[PDB]
Every structure is written in C-alpha cells, then in structure tokens.
Ligand binder design. Structure first.
Ligand SMILES: CC(C)(COP(=O)(O)OP(=O)(O)OC[C@H]1O[C@@H](n2cnc3c(N)ncnc32)[C@H](O)[C@@H]1OP(=O)(O)O)[C@@H](O)C(=O)NCCC(=O)NCCS
Ligand SMILES: CC(C)(COP(=O)(O)OP(=O)(O)OC[C@H]1O[C@@H](n2cnc3c(N)ncnc32)[C@H](O)[C@@H]1OP(=O)(O)O)[C@@H](O)C(=O)NCCC(=O)NCCS
Ligand SMILES: CC(C)(COP(=O)(O)OP(=O)(O)OC[C@H]1O[C@@H](n2cnc3c(N)ncnc32)[C@H](O)[C@@H]1OP(=O)(O)O)[C@@H](O)C(=O)NCCC(=O)NCCS
Ligand SMILES: [K+]
Ligand SMILES: [Mg+2]
Ligand SMILES: [Mg+2]
Ligand SMILES: [Mg+2]
Lengths: 124, 124, 124
C-alpha cells in the first residue's frame, strides 16, 4: 500500500526573483510556458505568483531527484476552474517521472511575507 | 495503492496576523473555536500559535480545492496528550471532504523567524 | 491503501542557528553525526546546510509525534550520489518508528532567504 515516490519543498524570495526576471529579458521565457505567464483573464501574471510557480518547479525536480537534463518547459503549472494549481509534466520531466513510476502529482503554493513556497508530492 | 487526495501549504506572517486580530475584535471568534483559543493549562493561546492554526486552516482548505461556503469553525486543530496537533473536520468542511473521499488528515505546524507555517495532507 | 503515518515541517532561521553553534562548542556534535558535518569533498558543511539538517530532524520528530527520549544522533541525513538527501534512522528514533509502523521516509530540504526549511513524511 506504499505509494509516495518523492517529496519536494522550495522557497523563493519574491523580490530577488523579480530582480532576476528584470535583469535578463530571456529568463521568463526559459522558465515558463506562455500559458503560465498569464492570468485566467489574459493579463500578465505577477512576480509573486511566478515566484511560486518557480518554487513549484524546483520542488518537482527535488521530488524526482533532480537529475540533469530536465527542461523547465516540460513542467507546467495549470489551474482548475475552481482555482486549484495543478502539475502537468511532459518530455524530459515525464520521462524521469516514468523511470520512477510516478502516476500522480500533488502541489500546493503560497506567497506571503515576501516568500513564495511550494510543496510537491509524487505518488505512484 | 494510491491514497493522497490533496496537499496544502500556508505561511502566515505572525506580526501581521496579530495586528489583524487586534484591529477587529470579532475576528478571533470567527476564525477559531473556543477550544483553539486556549492552551491546555487554560490560559489564552498566543499570537504565533494562533497564526499557525490559521495557516493550518488555509492549508486544509487548499488540500480540498478551497470551494466556497466552508466555515472556519468547521475545522478544528486539537492536541494529543503527547502534544501532536490534529485536525478534526465537521459540517461544511467534512461534507467537502466526503465529496473527495478523504478518510485521514495529516498536519504539522511550525512558528519561527516570525512566520507560522503549516502543511496538510488529505488521504483516502 | 492508506499509508501515511505522519508529516512534519520545520523552519530554522539560519543566522540564529549559526550563532547557537558558535556560542556552545559542544552543540554541533550533539546534533550531528561526523558524516553530516562534512561535504562530499571532505570540507566542513556550512551553516545554512546544517540548519536545513536540523530542520529535517525537528520535522522527523514531529512526524513521529516527538516523544521524549529520542537522540539527535539516531537520525542521519545522508546523500545519494545524485544529490538527493535521505533519512536513515537507528536506535531510539527507529524504535519509535517501529511502534508506529513506519517503513519509508521521505525528506526534502530548502535553504534560501536566510531560512532553512524541511518537510518529512513517514509512510508504512
Ligand atoms: C538541486 C536543486 C533542486 C536545489 O534547489 P535550489 O532552489 O537551488 O536550492 P534549495 O536551497 O532550495 O535546495 C537545496 C537542497 O536541495 C537538496 N538537493 C540537492 N540535490 C538534490 C537532488 N538531486 N534531488 C533532490 N534534492 C536535492 C539538498 O538537500 C540541498 O541542500 P543541501 O546541499 O544543504 O543538502 C537545484 O539546484 C536544481 O538542480 N534544480 C533543477 C531544476 C530543474 O531541473 N528544473 C527543470 C524541470 S522542472
Ligand atoms: C485560495 C486561498 C486558500 C489562498 O490562500 P491565501 O492564504 O489567501 O493565499 P496564499 O498566497 O497562501 O495562496 C495562494 C495560492 O493558493 C492557490 N489556490 C488558489 N485557489 C485555490 C483553490 N481553489 N484550491 C487550492 N489552492 C488554491 C493558488 O496557487 C494561489 O497562488 P497563485 O494565485 O499565485 O497561483 C484563500 O484565498 C481561501 O479562499 N481560503 C479559504 C479558507 C477557508 O475556506 N477556510 C474555512 C474552512 S477551514
Ligand atoms: C515539539 C518540537 C518538535 C517543536 O519543534 P520546534 O522547532 O521547537 O518548534 P516549532 O515552532 O517548529 O513547532 C512548534 C509546533 O510543533 C507542534 N508540536 C508540539 N509537540 C508535538 C509533538 N509531540 N508531535 C508533533 N508536533 C508537535 C505544535 O503544533 C507546535 O506549535 P503549537 O504549540 O503552537 O501548536 C520540539 O520542541 C521538540 O520536542 N523536538 C524534539 C527533537 C528530537 O526529538 N530530536 C531528536 C531525534 S531526531
Ligand atoms: K498509499
Ligand atoms: Mg530553492
Ligand atoms: Mg496564505
Ligand atoms: Mg521549529
């Protein structure tokens, strides 16, 4: 009845992360899919919210043992109608997930007190 | 053998939370059951400890997909003889939990460096 | 198909933790096994990294309901070739783990923004 394959936690300082995006124009497009960079309404997603998604991808990597060769764009945080964040993995991340037998992904995000936090659990 | 239904994490800045309780007298009684507002000895529970319980309820909500209509007073953090915090859900929260098939609740709390953190896992 | 026995989260302020180690020479050897105090290369492990391991041990204790009589040196954070942190429990911690039926340990560590965080899940 055992099913947890890995867990990850990650914490990002929002202000630092925002500074990093502003300094290198190409960075946001390297870390995020077009869909993640937008709010449901169509406006550009804000720094704290992006920092939480960055934290989610770091946490996901940790859950998988963070091997080399994983692409940021092969993990996607998407959002249920109800508002709940979800992980979708493709390509390199999905391949690594399959090596370990991961069937289900669980994520939660928080951004408060200028830190963005994420927890991720991989189950299979 | 899969059993995780949801996870939640939440982080509350203690000082801000304390300020919010002081500003609106009715707030503490809206967020907490009489039992949560007391220490085992019978003295009033402190701000950092209440902030961690607030974080626990936010995390629990996230674990359930945070639908509308949940009452703060339908989630209760109680404490084992040994000191371990526990979640008890009733009414609206329990009903939502039943929709998703949640049988067991796991929580942990931390308050240090002026932030209160909670993680919650719903299993079934 | 239920298997989660406990979860723990803990957050340590790095600067405070470093101050505590410096103030009392004996503290590091009370909290850590010789192996934890070193980096893979053989150099002394740094404060933030030790703070995350301290957080891991606090989180592990929480996952077990933090009974009296557990030794810090009966929990060991070790490191896979790939870099992933792992928990190994012996003696008092393993005995408590056996009382609860714990078979598997899951940990993740983070140190950023001057806080070290750990999450631990005990499964069985
Ligand atoms: C290893 C990595 C995850 C660390 O995360 P970070 O945000 O840079 O640093 P954090 O302080 O949050 O985490 C550091 C801790 O992660 C842990 N870690 C290191 N390597 C790891 C690995 N292979 N697997 C899981 N955890 C690992 C360690 O415990 C480390 O602390 P320690 O050295 O003191 O023990 C990061 O450097 C990395 O390689 N990220 C890859 C991201 C990626 O692949 N993304 C694309 C796909 S989504
Ligand atoms: C949605 C909610 C949980 C967010 O928590 P918060 O403390 O206000 O804000 P945080 O920064 O900690 O969390 C925000 C993140 O939560 C996530 N979130 C939003 N809606 C969610 C939902 N329906 N389910 C799970 N997670 C959700 C998102 O990832 C969001 O970040 P993002 O917008 O950048 O993606 C909160 O606004 C809420 O509706 N709480 C309800 C509490 C409740 O029902 N209590 C009574 C019963 S205990
Ligand atoms: C109880 C203990 C874990 C608290 O951790 P801490 O870092 O001092 O304090 P934190 O703020 O991070 O956590 C406090 C929260 O832990 C929770 N906690 C207290 N007793 C607990 C127990 N028996 N089991 C699980 N959680 C407990 C409570 O929710 C508490 O907050 P609250 O009083 O406001 O409800 C700690 O005091 C302790 O006894 N550590 C033992 C460590 C140990 O045995 N190590 C050796 C083996 S690795
Ligand atoms: K299971
Ligand atoms: Mg990090
Ligand atoms: Mg919050
Ligand atoms: Mg602590």
């Amino acid at each position: 009845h055992m099913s947890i394959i890995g867990v990850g936690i990650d914490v990002a300082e929002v202000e630092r992360f925002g500074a990093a995006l502003e300094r290198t124009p190409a960075l946001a497009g390297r870390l995020f899919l077009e869909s993640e960079l937008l709010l449901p309404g169509g406006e550009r997603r804000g720094v704290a919210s992006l920092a939480a998604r960055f934290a989610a991808k770091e946490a996901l990597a940790k859950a998988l043992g963070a091997p080399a060769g994983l692409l940021w764009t092969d993990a996607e945080v998407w959002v249920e109608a109800g508002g709940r964040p979800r992980l979708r993995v493709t390509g390199t991340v999905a391949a690594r997930a399959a090596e370990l037998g991961v069937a289900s992904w669980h994520v939660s995000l928080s951004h408060d007190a200028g830190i963005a936090s994420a927890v991720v659990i991989a189950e299979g």
